[PDB]
Every structure is written in C-alpha cells, then in structure tokens.
Amino acid sequence: TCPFYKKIPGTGFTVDAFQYGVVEGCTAYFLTHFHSDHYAGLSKHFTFPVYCSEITGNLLKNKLHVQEQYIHPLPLDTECIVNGVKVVLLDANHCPGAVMILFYLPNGTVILHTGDFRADPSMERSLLADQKVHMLYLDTTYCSPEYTFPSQQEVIRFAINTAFEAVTLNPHALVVCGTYSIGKEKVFLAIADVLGSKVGMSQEKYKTLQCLNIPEINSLITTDMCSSLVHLLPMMQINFKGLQSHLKKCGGKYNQILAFRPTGWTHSNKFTRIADVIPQTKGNISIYGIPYSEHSSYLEMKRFVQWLKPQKIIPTVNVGTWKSRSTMEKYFREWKLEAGY
Numbered sequence: 001t002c003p004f005y006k007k008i009p010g011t012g013f014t015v016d017a018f019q020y021g022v023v024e025g026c027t028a029y030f031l032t033h034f035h036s037d038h039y040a041g042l043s044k045h046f047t048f049p050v051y052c053s054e055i056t057g058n059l060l061k062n063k064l065h066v067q068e069q070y071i072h073p074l075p076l077d078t079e080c081i082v083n084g085v086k087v088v089l090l091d092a093n094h095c096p097g098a099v100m101i102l103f104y105l106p107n108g109t110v111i112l113h114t115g116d117f118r119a120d121p122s123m124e125r126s127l128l129a130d131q132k133v134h135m136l137y138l139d140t141t142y143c144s145p146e147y148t149f150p151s152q153q154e155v156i157r158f159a160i161n162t163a164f165e166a167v168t169l170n171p172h173a174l175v176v177c178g179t180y181s182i183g184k185e186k187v188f189l190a191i192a193d194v195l196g197s198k199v200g201m202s203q204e205k206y207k208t209l210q211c212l213n214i215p216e217i218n219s220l221i222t223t224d225m226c227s228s229l230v231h232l233l234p235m236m237q238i239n240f241k242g243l244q245s246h247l248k249k250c251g252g253k254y255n256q257i258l259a260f261r262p263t264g265w266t267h268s269n270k271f272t273r274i275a276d277v278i279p280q281t282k283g284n285i286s287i288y289g290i291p292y293s294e295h296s297s298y299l300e301m302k303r304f305v306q307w308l309k310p311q312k313i314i315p316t317v318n319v320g321t322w323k324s325r326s327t328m329e330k331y332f333r334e335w336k337l338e339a340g341y
C-alpha cells in the first residue's frame with residue numbers, strides 16, 4: 001500500500017508511486033525522474049496518465065516501452081493545468097530530466113515536492129521566489145551535519161587533471177568510468193573532452209544516453225570501443241578482477257587502467273580534502289572513489305529550507321527508522337528557531 005508521503009492531499013495525485021498497483025483515488029501519477037527506486041512498477045502495460053519532464057518521457061517510451069498515449073510531458077518553468085489543478089515543474093539539479101513539482105491546491109495551499117535534488121542558490125531565483133509554500137516534501141538523503149562534500153566543479157577539476165596527467169605520462173593507459181543509472185554524465189564527458197576521445201559504451205547505455213537531449217552528444221559518445229580511450233562499464237565491474245578481465249579484452253592496445261567510481265558520500269569525507277584523494281592500486285590498475293553527489297549536502301539543504309520557510313516539512317528519505325525520523329525533526333526545529341519562522 002502507498003505510503004502517506006507519496007500522496008498529495010486535496011488532489012487526485014501521487015508522486016513516484018508505481019509499485020503499489022492501482023492507488024485508490026489516484027487520477028494522475030507524477031514521476032520526478034528516471035531512477036529505479038522511483039519508477040519501480042512502470043512498463044508497456046501501464047494505462048493511467050503519467051506526468052513528467054520531456055526527458056523522463058523519452059526514457060519511459062524507449063526504455064520501458066510505455067505507450068505514448070499515456071505519457072504526458074510538461075515544459076519546465078511553465079504554469080500548466082492538470083485535472084483542474086495548477087502545477088509547475090522546476091529543475092531539481094539531480095540527473096537529467098529530474099524535476100521538483102509545485103502544486104497550487106484549489107483551497108489556496110501551495111506544496112513543493114522536491115523529488116530527489118541537490119539544493120542550489122540558483123533555485124532562490126526560479127518561480128519559487130514569487131509565493132509562499134505551506135508544505136515541503138523534502139529529499140532528506142544526507143540530512144546530518146557529517147555529510148559534507150565538495151562542489152561538483154571541484155570534483156570534475158580533480159578528475160580531468162588526474163586523467164590528463166596519467167595518459168600524458170602513459171599514452172597506453174585506458175580510462176574506465178563506472179555507471180549503473182543515469183546521472184553524473186559530466187564525469188566521463190569531461191574526461192573524454194580533455195583527452196580528445198569519444199566515450200565508448202554498450203549499445204544499451206548508448207540508447208539511454210540518446211534519450212537525454214544533451215547538446216552535441218553524437219560528437220561525444222560511441223559504441224565503437226576500439227576507437228575510444230575512455231570506456232564506460234557497469235559499476236559492479238569496477239574492482240581489480242573486473243578490470244583485469246576488461247584489459248585482457250582490449251588485445252594489447254593498453255597496458256594500464258585508471259578507473260573512476262563516482263560514489264555519493266563515503267566517511268573518507270570527514271577527514272580528507274578532494275586535493276588529497278588517493279587511489280587503491282594493484283599492479284597496473286588504480287581505482288579512485290570520487291565524491292560526486294547529486295543530492296544536497298547538509299549545509300545546502302539547510303540553506304534552502306531556511307530560505308523557503310515552509311510551515312510543515314515531510315521527509316521522503318530515511319523515513320523507515322524512529323532514530324532517523326527523530327534526528328531529522330530535531331534539525332528541522334533548530335533551523336526554524338535559528339532563522340525565526
């Protein structure tokens with residue numbers, strides 16, 4: 001059964017609620033982004049209206065084979081009417097096609113559902129700035145002060161410089177980047193750009209990337225592995241055994257692998273600066289874990305909420321334990337007392 005925090009009161013609407021069968025009273029199913037924990041349940045047999053971004057709609061049609069007549073893409077930053085209720089989709093600064101949803105209830109209440117997001121000051125100048133929000137359904141993934149990580153720009157700087165140095169020292173080194181979902185495309189695209197190569201990948205991954213409206217993409221990606229010196233592999237293969245095996249398959253073209261695992265947070269963040277990050281090495285293989293996040297750090301989240309000043313917060317992540325829930329509620333109260341709302 002559908003949990004309360006995926007339901008929008010006063011509407012026929014649910015958010016990211018496709019794994020519960022037919023939800024009683026739901027007239028429209030919203031999907032914030034194309035990640036499996038959120039789309040779980042969608043397929044070509046779905047016959048209710050799905051509301052989403054253009055990019056998410058490309059992925060629904062091409063990857064899950066949802067029929068076109070049930071896909072309802074909306075433009076961002078535009079007031080739209082859905083079953084008699086005004087809604088707006090806003091960029092969530094998560095993965096490609098990921099949105100926040102603003103709902104203007106018939107009784108005058110305004111609700112923001114962040115979906116998954118990485119809070120940014122740029123959000124303080126969207127259509128959020130123009131009215132009060134009463135209720136916030138918040139992505140609380142990293143809602144604790146231990147969760148710090150660097151900007152995406154610093155992380156990409158580190159990766160570009162690391163890769164360019166290694167390959168200039170050894171033109172027979174291969175760079176490998178791990179992936180298991182959409183998101184974090186800048187890692188592998190930035191590295192390929194500094195090295196003057198395309199990124200090589202499976203046909204299934206190339207198909208996924210072709211749904212994303214990224215400019216000039218036919219110029220940056222390929223299925224021809226033999227012509228590429230940046231390869232994408234499943235995240236599960238980014239270990240010494242999986243990489244030794246891959247290196248065999250390249251037929252003596254290469255004699256070294258430098259690999260990258262974009263994680264979210266790991267506890268090496270509580271001690272070490274990005275400048276100071278070192279790989280794990282075995283023989284001719286090195287693996288770097290880089291803290292490239294597409295969710296808010298604690299400080300980013302706090303700033304957003306203290307700016308927005310919602311009347312009520314409903315967490316959507318880490319809700320399954322009493323200790324988590326109690327922790328989060330204590331931070332929410334601190335933020336409110338420090339800011340004065």
Ligand code: NI
Nearest residue numbers: 033035094116
């Ligand atoms: Ni996500």
